[PDB]
Design a protein around this ligand. Sequence first.
Ligand SMILES: CCCCCCCCCCCCCCCCCC(=O)OC[C@H](COP(=O)([O-])OCC[N+](C)(C)C)OC(=O)CCCCCCCCCCCCCCCCC
Ligand SMILES: CCCCCCCCCCCCCCCCCC(=O)OC[C@H](COP(=O)(O)OCCN)OC(=O)CCCCCCCCCCCCCCCCC
Ligand SMILES: CCCCCCCCCCCCO[C@@H]1O[C@H](CO)[C@@H](O[C@H]2O[C@H](CO)[C@@H](O)[C@H](O)[C@H]2O)[C@H](O)[C@H]1O
Ligand SMILES: CCCCCCCCCCCCO[C@@H]1O[C@H](CO)[C@@H](O[C@H]2O[C@H](CO)[C@@H](O)[C@H](O)[C@H]2O)[C@H](O)[C@H]1O
Ligand code: SF4
Ligand code: SF4
Ligand code: SF4
Lengths: 318, 176, 115, 94, 70, 154, 360, 96
Amino acid sequence: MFMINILMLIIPILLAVAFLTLVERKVLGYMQLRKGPNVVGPYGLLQPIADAIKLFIKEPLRPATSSASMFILAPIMALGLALTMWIPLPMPYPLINMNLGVLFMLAMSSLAVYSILWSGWASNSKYALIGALRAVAQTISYEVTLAIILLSVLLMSGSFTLSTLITTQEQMWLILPAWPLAMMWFISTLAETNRAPFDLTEGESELVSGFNVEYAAGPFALFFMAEYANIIMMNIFTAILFLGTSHNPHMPELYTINFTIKSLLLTMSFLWIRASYPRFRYDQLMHLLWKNFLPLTLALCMWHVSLPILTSGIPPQT
Amino acid sequence: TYKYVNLREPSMDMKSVTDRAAQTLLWTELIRGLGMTLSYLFREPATINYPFEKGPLSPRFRGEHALRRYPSGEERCIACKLCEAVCPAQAITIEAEPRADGSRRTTRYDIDMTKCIYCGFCQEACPVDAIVEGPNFEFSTETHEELLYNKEKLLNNGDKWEAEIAANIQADYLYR
Amino acid sequence: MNLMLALLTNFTLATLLVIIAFWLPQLNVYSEKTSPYECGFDPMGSARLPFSMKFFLVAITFLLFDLEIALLLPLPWASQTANLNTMLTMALFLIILLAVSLAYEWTQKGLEWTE
Amino acid sequence: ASATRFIQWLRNWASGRDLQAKLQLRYQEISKRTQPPPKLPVGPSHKLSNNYYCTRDGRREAMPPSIVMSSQKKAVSPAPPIKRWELSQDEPYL
Amino acid sequence: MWFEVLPGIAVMGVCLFIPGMATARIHRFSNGGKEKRVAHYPYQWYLMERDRRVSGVNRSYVSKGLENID
Amino acid sequence: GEYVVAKLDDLINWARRSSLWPMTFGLACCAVEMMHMAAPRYDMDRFGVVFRASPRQSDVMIVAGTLTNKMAPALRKVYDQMPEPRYVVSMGSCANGGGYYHYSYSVVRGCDRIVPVDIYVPGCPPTAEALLYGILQLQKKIKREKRLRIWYRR
Amino acid sequence: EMVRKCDPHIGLLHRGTEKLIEYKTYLQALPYFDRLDYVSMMCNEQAYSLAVEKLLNIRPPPRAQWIRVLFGEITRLLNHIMAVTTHALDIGAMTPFFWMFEEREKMFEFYERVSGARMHAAYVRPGGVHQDLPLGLMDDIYEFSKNFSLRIDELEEMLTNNRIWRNRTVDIGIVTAEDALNYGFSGVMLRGSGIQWDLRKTQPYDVYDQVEFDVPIGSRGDCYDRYLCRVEEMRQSIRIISQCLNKMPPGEIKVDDAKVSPPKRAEMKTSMESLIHHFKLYTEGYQVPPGATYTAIEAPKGEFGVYLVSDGSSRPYRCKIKAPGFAHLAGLDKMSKGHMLADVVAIIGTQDIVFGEVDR
Amino acid sequence: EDNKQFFGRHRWVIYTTEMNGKNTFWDVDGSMVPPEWHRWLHCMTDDPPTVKPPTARKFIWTNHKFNLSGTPQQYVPYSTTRKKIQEWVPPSTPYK
Ligand SMILES: CCCCCCCCCCCCCCCCCC(=O)OC[C@H](COP(=O)([O-])OCC[N+](C)(C)C)OC(=O)CCCCCCCCCCCCCCCCC
Ligand SMILES: CCCCCCCCCCCCCCCCCC(=O)OC[C@H](COP(=O)(O)OCCN)OC(=O)CCCCCCCCCCCCCCCCC
Ligand SMILES: CCCCCCCCCCCCO[C@@H]1O[C@H](CO)[C@@H](O[C@H]2O[C@H](CO)[C@@H](O)[C@H](O)[C@H]2O)[C@H](O)[C@H]1O
Ligand SMILES: CCCCCCCCCCCCO[C@@H]1O[C@H](CO)[C@@H](O[C@H]2O[C@H](CO)[C@@H](O)[C@H](O)[C@H]2O)[C@H](O)[C@H]1O
Ligand code: SF4
Ligand code: SF4
Ligand code: SF4
């Protein structure tokens, strides 16, 4: 009954990712005064299936100069780690209930970076290498700010357990006492997922396709699936972190409905932002985080350390 | 006269300064940009439903070539070769001789549609309205050789499209 | 066990997809197809040549800042101590020294990329 | 044009304009696709008299260049200095 | 029109609803109709192990009440 | 036997023609009408046609403009770097047969001296709608492929 | 990612246009000018027509001159939409391209309605224009122009005040006023640096002396100022178009001289002189008196000129084409000093380059 | 037609399911529109051929054919001129 539970998690994720690509193409279409897919299936509903089948019957390529083992390893890590990020999510019950779910996701997200570094490096081509080193730059920009932003929020929750964030937000969303952190967190998730305006490791208009320019067919699809699975997961995490849904233990489906709507809307906002802004220069991303978010995050970290003590609002360990 | 596109010194009163600090910290001008694309999301898209809906054209449209006839069915082309002389692309090739009844008619009339620039000079030069560019633009082919038209192809195009060609010429010949 | 089962399934599914991707499609491999990509013209030199890092000084500072989080991450637990007078002083002390280190590198142009 | 009043309100508020007055989709305000025939005017040279071509032949009034110097007093410039542009009174600063 | 984007959102929404619903239902089915016991700390695990011994069927989610007190 | 492979062709053909990704590759004038096919009025994306810059992630090459001798080795290169199956659409007179520079010392007289071409779209330039007609004609060509039926009868 | 040297290798779209023109009559060579800066077709036609008209010593009629200025400014709008929106698209802001290419699509309909072609109209010719405006076209052009400024406003609501846009363009590719002149720059590549110069004001052609408009001028010579100059130029184009619509005079559309401009078809089929001249103009073409002219216009991308040599026959002897993008691109390495890879992507856009004119 | 729709969407054709022997239930293309309706569909005119029919000529095709490329009916080019040089044909009897 646990293996069935695992399949009830990852198969829907791959279906949600498939239809997220359709929803992105439609939403950007209408914001761009056009329609987007509406021929392949009614309202384009069969488009993701056609794209999936086409890629997996397309010829994969191993570049002559590439490092074979790392070339193939890199897409497997990308999808493997993207799905691993979902096992601790309380929806409202996690598949795996971790004491330190917040830190587990931080560690896995750091490991998922290497699927970019090694794919770009193993490709042994210049555009792939340039994209890979942008990933190094991008991680340096957001990782320090991201962890300290989380720490400030967890000082009101009192735990690293993701399920405790549900209990913390039983009377009120944490976005009220921490909207300055929610703002910087929301930006950090765009940088963390290589999403526009921080889509730099791929950066179509500068690097052709960046770190995965040499990938084709199925191996390319794994990277694309991993990206969109990370988009949804990070918006679920944002919803749990700042827009806590009340949980009724006798009607857990009602949590899952309200919780899903919030995550969809947050994911829709990622598409909305992509349609609205130009791309950052990747040294301007580093300065944004280090010169703006970091000084403010450090100050808010001290503030949220002190605030529970001075207001006598320290949460419990459980 | 001239104007300055970017030469304005911003005011330094605490209200204006505080307004800009709010803009920097609350992202108000980036939020405002989100409003615009949101407004477009709720506008009717401009997409037409091709091939069930077509884009609008005019009677002057320069499309596929065709050789025309008189109402009797006689060919208008008299092998004057004015179209062949004016063709900027040298896309027209003509040979002529007296017909079996003595008429001055072509025995070759080729248009290399992969040389042609669809410029319409040939139909301007023609003194008898023999060669025209019809309204058809949907004749892409699967081979290069299919785009090398000879006289039989062009005469068939004339018979195929004459109903529309005549009506377009009727609507625009008074501008010529 | 459950966690190990979950990780194995995730990376087992990913590997199966790669296997299918490599053995299902019809392949036609030749030298020009697999040559390195660079916008239609042959690459000029090796992609293994050194690639200068302009943010090298920020990258080292990240290593030192990236260890501040390990020292600060225990703070939610430390807030449960009886000795809150000592806590808050030491927590604020660490963050301030981290802020001071950032200010020093900032004012000394350590965050500017080299040209 | 078929959008409901609520949606008209919503996209007006979001854009900050009155989008309905200046729609980017064309309806029936455009010209009809069938027009009456024209009757175009003729040019100045459409006269039956006093119209000899040799009095209106531009190509034949073209002459070879004037040789100023051939190797076979105040200083001058090529033309008077250009006047300094004046600022617009319509909108001098964008 | 813009509401032609809704069908793809609903299908995306339904897919994201399944993992949360399935986990909640599978937990109840495999835990005697109750929430899965949460053991974050050694104490909670100790009690859970004790329930497995008390159950008499080697199942920590099989509960014994006053009818087991003679 | 025949029935299963017959349906399997229909499936792989349907997927390939419903998900056609042209290379982001334009040469001259005709690339402007290629842009207008991506623009709202025609919205190629609604047919499942999506530009992707990398040759590795592209199915179709639309040769949109004049091919010079200097450019010819580069065009062949990125074509060779597409994975298969791959298709070439020749757009406009220049690509089709040299066009108005046919007699130039620096122009390739038709891109089909360099690559195989599936579809020839006439015009100088073809209208955006004419190119869309060519793309849909390429789709119907792919709908008729018999890869598995022929394999089964080998 | 710091750029140490830019070496633009061109000629990938060199098509011996200038050598081909020597084998054509003056009329036969006119369509070659559509395919140079193939975003600004009718302006290129105008530059070539003025050079031939100057060599011929003839004058196009007043109505043709007004149609030329009208469609020249419609053509300027097409160019600046392509320039700004593709410039934004490269920098990452893809949405404006879609909103504004629906406007470009409607302006292609004006091209197609007067000439039968959306792009390579071949409409402006030495001696005037090919055909008169079809009835009801000026109403539709007015309908389009009534709403266009709002479209520019939506474009500015996305870019002008956007901090991400300004970060990608402000102080990028600065060029001093003296360097721009000595490097051969023209158009917005001069006005961005403050040089007050516009050939429509200083060396007017056709009826440009009879319209009011302002010349946008920059103060920092960077990408952002050139972006603002181009956007403000679109507004001034609408301002000119409003005047052309209101002041369009009646009359013929090509010079009433049948040794240069062909006769009407009805006349050619009735009058012996008209048939002879029609026959000769479409076979030999008109002879042009021997001479050489350098003639230039304020094309949307800059100063576009032709050095046209006539040997007295009906075919040009030499036709050197001056493309503004040729000198702008030659300064790309100079403008990119001390910038990164992504900045050079912006500097290529801010120069507004079409390789049909650069390579010819 | 629906003149409430914006210009470009106010006219449309629902293609037949069979034309000249071809099953066009799924396979449609713009070349199936006959010339008389082609003018009205593309907005080159305001009057449909029902109201304003085209002029009849005995040589105009009574049956419109769609694009025949890629089929046994495709056009194949060839030279339409006769042989230019006539060769000498030697005698049929031996004398030598
Ligand atoms: C999110 C995940 C999505 C995954 C989607 C996966 C695709 C689902 C749809 C599958 C439909 C069948 C696809 C067949 C496509 C085959 C490629 C092709 O067209 O080649 C033409 C070839 C025909 O080649 P041929 O013999 O005619 O000639 C080839 C030689 N030249 C090039 C000279 C002509 O088809 C085949 O060879 C066999 C067809 C097999 C069809 C059934 C599939 C079995 C394949 C098993 C392979 C053995 C290894 C096991 C791999 C694991 C399999 C799960
Ligand atoms: C009682 C005592 C109380 C004590 C605590 C009081 C604290 C209250 C005041 C705190 C300040 C509030 C603002 C905090 C958010 C961070 C603000 C910020 O960092 O903005 C500056 C940053 C850089 O802007 P820039 O002008 O380029 O740099 C300065 C010029 N040298 O600007 C940027 O970040 C640019 C971001 C570009 C990318 C934006 C793309 C997304 C935009 C739409 C998202 C809208 C917000 C969504 C939020 C979602 C929340 C779920
Ligand atoms: C360059 C080096 C920079 C070093 C900067 C160090 C800054 C440290 C500032 C002082 C921070 C703590 O400040 C101190 O906090 C404790 C609370 O924990 C307060 O103490 C108060 O609350 C505690 C418990 O919470 C009670 O037991 C006590 O009766 C009461 O006085 C002190 O009144 C306050 O002075
Ligand atoms: C306790 C946590 C919160 C406290 C804040 C801790 C971080 C403090 C960061 C340093 C602030 C002072 O140090 C910083 O030095 C540089 C000198 O290069 C100053 O000046 C520089 O900054 C800005 C941005 O880089 C440039 O536009 C300017 O041209 C340059 O002069 C900054 O204006 C100043 O902010
Ligand atoms: S349209 Fe122009 S290029 Fe084509 S055949 Fe006629 S004259 Fe020649
Ligand atoms: S088509 Fe017209 S111009 Fe050409 S040879 Fe025949 S009659 Fe003369
Ligand atoms: S075919 Fe015509 S439009 Fe296309 S590149 Fe050649 S000349 Fe330009």
